[PDB]
C-alpha cells in the first residue's frame, strides 16, 4: 500500500508519496529507461491501495489498477464506491469486500464522463494539495455530483502526477494555493496513451515516433514530439502504458 497525509504536508512529503506510488507499480522492463507497466496482472495483485488522509485525519482508501494507474473505486468508512465500468466492477470482486455496502457511481472514470457529471471541464477546476483535502472530504459521504469533481482532482493529483514529473511539480507549486491546471498539464494527461505507444514503437524505429505527438509546452506554446530525444521522454514521462492495453 502507499499513503499520503495532508496534515503537515509540504512539497517534499507530496513528492515522497508520488515516488512511493510510482515504486508500487510493477514492471519487468524499461523502455528508453522508463518503466513499462505490465500487460496484465491476475487477481487481487492487480490493485494498489492508496491511503489518503485529509487535514483532520479522516481517510479514504483508493484502489488503483497497476497496469494503467486507473482509479477503480475507493472505500470511505464502511461503504465502497466504484466507477460504472467493467474494469471497476471486476475490481469490486477483489477489493473492499468487507464494506457494509457497495455503491456503483452513476458514471465511468474517464475525463469526458466525469466532466459531464461535475458540470465543468477540468480547465476550470482548481487543483493542488488544498483541493485534494477537499476531495477526500467530499468522498467521505456520498454525493455523486460533488464526487465527480472530487474525483477529477484526485485522479490529477495522484495518477497523473505519478505519470509525469511536470505534473508532480505543478502540484508541488500548489501545495498551499490551488490553481487550475496549466494547458500543458491537460495536454500531457490527454497524451499519455499516445506517448506511451509512440515510445514503445520507437524501439525498432531508431528512436523515431511512427506518428508525432502534438503537445502544449510549459510556456503555453504548441510543440510537436517526434523522437525519444525530446525532454518529454528523457525527463518528464515516468510510466508507460503497455501497447498491449492500447
Ligand atoms: C528529434 O527531437 C529533437 C528534440 O525535440 C529535435 O530537436 C530534432 O529536430 C528531432 N530529430 C529528428 C531526427 O527527428
Ligand atoms: O480513464 C479512466 C477510467 C477509470 N479510471 C481512471 O482513473 N481513468
Q: What is the DSSP string of 38-61?
A: -S---GGGGEEEEEEE-TTS-EEE
Residue 181 backbone phi and psi in degrees, to 5: -60, 140
Q: Is the CB of 109 under 6 A from ligand 2?
A: yes
Closest CA to ligand 2's atom 1 = 110
Cα separation values, 38 from 98, 149, 244, Å: 28, 29, 9
Question: CB neighbours (10 Å) of residue 92?
Answer: 19
Distance CA 240, CA 72 (A): 19
CA of 206 to the centre of ligand 2 (A): 32
Question: CB neighbours (10 Å) of residue 103?
Answer: 15
Question: Ligand 2 pocket check: which of 46, 81, 84, 108 to mutate, most ligand atoms within 8 Å of Cβ?
Answer: 108
Q: Is the CB of 234 under 6 A from ligand 1?
A: no
Ramachandran area for residue 61 (φ above 0: left; ψ -120 to 50: alpha; else beta): beta
> How deeply is 154 buried, as exposed, middle or buried, from its count of CB atoms within 10 A (0-12, 13-18, 19+)?
buried
Active site residues: 160
Residue 41 backbone phi and psi in degrees, to 5: -145, 130
Contact 47, 70 (CB under 8 A): no
Looking at domain 163-246, its CATH class is few secondary structures
Question: CB neighbours (10 Å) of residue 245?
Answer: 15
CA 107 to chain centre: 17
Listed in order, strand segments (DSSP E) in the chain are 2-5, 27-31, 34-37, 47-53, 59-65, 70-76, 79-82, 101-104, 208-216, 222-227
- The residue ranges of every structural domain in the chain are 1-162, 163-246
Identify the nearest ligand to the CA of 110 by its number: 2
Q: Is the CB of 17 under 6 A from ligand 2?
A: no
Method: X-ray
Q: Is the CB of 187 under 6 A from ligand 1?
A: no
CA of 110 to the centre of ligand 2 (A): 5
* Cell of residue 19, nine digits: 515516488
**Is the sign of the CA dihedral 241, 243, 245, 246 positive or negative?**
positive
Contact 73, 108 (CB under 8 A): no
Could you give the angle at which helices 129-139 and 144-155 cross, rounded to 10 degrees?
A: 140
Angle 206-209-212 (CA atoms, 0-180°, nearest 5)? Answer: 155
- Residue count of the chain: 246
Identify the nearest ligand to the CA of 206 by its number: 1
- CATH fit for domain 1-162, picks 3.40.420.10, 3.40.50.2000, 3.40.228.10, 3.90.1150.10: 3.40.420.10
Q: Residue 240 pairs with which residues in a beta bridge?
A: 36
Distance CA 129, CA 12 (A): 12
Q: Which helix (H) or strand (E) holds 153?
A: helix 144-155
Amino acid at each position: 500500500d502507499v499513503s499520503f497525509r495532508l496534515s503537515g504536508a509540504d512539497p517534499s512529503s507530496y513528492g515522497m508519496f508520488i515516488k512511493d506510488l510510482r515504486n508500487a507499480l510493477p514492471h519487468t522492463e524499461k523502455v528508453y529507461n522508463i518503466p513499462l507497466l505490465l500487460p496484465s496482472v491476475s487477481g487481487a495483485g492487480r490493485y494498489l491501495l492508496m491511503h489518503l488522509f485529509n487535514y483532520d485525519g479522516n481517510t479514504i482508501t483508493v484502489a488503483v489498477d497497476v497496469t494503467n494507474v486507473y482509479i477503480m473505486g475507493y472505500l470511505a468508512l464502511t461503504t465502497s464506491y466504484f466507477f460504472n465500468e467493467p474494469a471497476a466492477d471486476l475490481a469490486s470482486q477483489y477489493v473492499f469486500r468487507s464494506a457494509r455496502r457497495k455503491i456503483t457511481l452513476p458514471y465511468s472514470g474517464n475525463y469526458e464522463r466525469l466532466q459531464i457529471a461535475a458540470g465543468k471541464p477540468r480547465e476550470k477546476i482548481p487543483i493542488g494539495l488544498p483541493a485534494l483535502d477537499t476531495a477526500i472530504s467530499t468522498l467521505l459521504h456520498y454525493d455523486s455530483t460533488a464526487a465527480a469533481g472530487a474525483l477529477l482532482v484526485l485522479i490529477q493529483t495522484t495518477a497523473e502526477a505519478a505519470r509525469f514529473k511536470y505534473i508532480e511539480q505543478q502540484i508541488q507549486e500548489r501545495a498551499y494555493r490551488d490553481e487550475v491546471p496549466s494547458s500543458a498539464t491537460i495536454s500531457l494527461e490527454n497524451s499519455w496513451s499516445g506517448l506511451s505507444k509512440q515510445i514503445q514503437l520507437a524501439q525498432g524505429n531508431n528512436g523515431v515516433f511512427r506518428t508525432p505527438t502534438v503537445l502544449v509546452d510549459s510556456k503555453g506554446n504548441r510543440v510537436q514530439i517526434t523522437n525519444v530525444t525530446s525532454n518529454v521522454v528523457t525527463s518528464n514521462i515516468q510510466l508507460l502504458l503497455n501497447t498491449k492495453n492500447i
